[PDB]
A and B are shown apart, each in its own frame.
Chain A
């Protein structure tokens, strides 16, 4: 029977120098101390941060510690350094190796509402038979921002793909781009194209719309 690992929280937003606490719960008891913690920075391979629940590999700073037993384990960063903001996984090896979903430690900053822009498809792309409508959410925090598409006030589903940038190094904000793809015929059949943005920094979802033909 596989041991499912669930980490808490999903995302940990703290300031540099604070204490980070990542919990790792298991669906079954982990024998002895067969648990490890890994750290992964963006674009890098996971690094063994801690082995044997509490033991520490050579080179890992003293600020990283590990405790727990049975089904509850905990990774602790006493003083968060700037290089510590990254993803952390827990892995049991009492049975078949399984990982937790991962916990992201990011910079904590003031709530920033996104600047919402919209871009219609170009005539050059319409000549190809496909219409891409782009919605840009510029410089917002936190990362959680819901983008919905409304074609003639009809909610879209399945024809939108979004992409998020990493947390910026200067203002610690995120940016998002949502592409709504239609056919040229489906694009000409409709008039109003609107991008609705829901974010914690907005007292109400903001809608950026344009009418085909005038744009």
Chain B
């Protein structure tokens, strides 16, 4: 079974050069093309490029003069460079085995340029921000955040970088009714998410959100008490 192992820098500043590497195990680079494909968060797939064991490269014409593909046959690896990186390049980058080389009677070359197997995928984020700890603000329950015997509260994990952060409720004891939303990349380059929880009205009961950010090693235990409205 041919296995693919991805690695490379997951953090870049704007205009820098993305560099990713993909090692092939259980098989050789010979006899197939090897492609890099990418997928922005919440969006579709986009074929970046392909390179074979001989060094021949092809790339998406929409990317113009950015793709630089390389092959290390001695290591059975292939690498992708994407210079002049921008915010539109923040994506999960997969490497996969492209089409094999077939030998027929009158023609020989590469066919069936589909992708199998796939790599695990490396998330490359483009941002001018550095490591920064989050600020946890209480989304407090009130008359505006209640519907009958059902109220809602939570926490806002604002301005942190990079991904990710973990949010628990009452040190993991509160799991039902919890919705931890995917983070959004703010215009400031910092991430931000919201973790809400639905509870009964009669309980309004201690609620504490535990936010953990490993890249900054910042842990915040914020108690959410009801406000007024």
Contacts and interface: CB of A to CB of B under 8 A. Distances in A.
Interface string A23-42: 00000000000101010000
B202 interface: no
Interface string B109-120: 000111111111
A45 B115 CA distance: 11
Given A118-B144, A214-B229, A134 B194 contact: yes
B137 A122 contact: yes
Nearest to A158: B187
B127 to A, nearest CB: 15
Contacts of A125: 135, 137, 156, 158
A51 B116 contact: yes
Interface stretch (B39-47, B161-169, B206-214): B39-47
Interface residues of B, number: 52
Given A99-B44, A132-B137, A215-B142, A91 B114 contact: yes
Contacts of A119: 139-140, 144-145, 154, 156
Contact of B35 (A97, A102, A132): A97
B186 interface: yes
Interface of B: 35, 44-47, 50, 58, 60-62, 94, 99, 112-121, 135, 137-140, 142, 144-147, 150, 152, 154, 156, 158, 179-184, 186, 192-194, 196, 198, 227-229
Contacts of B158: 125, 130, 132
Interface of A: 2, 34, 36, 38, 45-48, 51-52, 57, 89, 91, 93, 96-102, 115, 117-122, 124-125, 128, 130, 132, 134, 136, 138, 161-165, 175-177, 179, 181, 208-210, 214-215
Nearest to B35: A97
Interface centre among B58, B144, B180, B182 (most CB of A within 10 A): B144
Given A93-B114, A96-B60, A210-B229, A161 B186 contact: yes
Contacts of A214: 228-229
A122 B138 contact: yes
A34 B110 CA distance: 12
Contacts of A181: 186
Contact of A138 (B94, B115, B138, B198): B198
Given A45-B121, A136-B145, A179-B194, A93 B112 contact: yes
B179 A165 contact: yes
B61 A2 contact: yes
Given A122-B138, A134-B139, A115 B147 contact: yes
B74 to A, nearest CB: 27
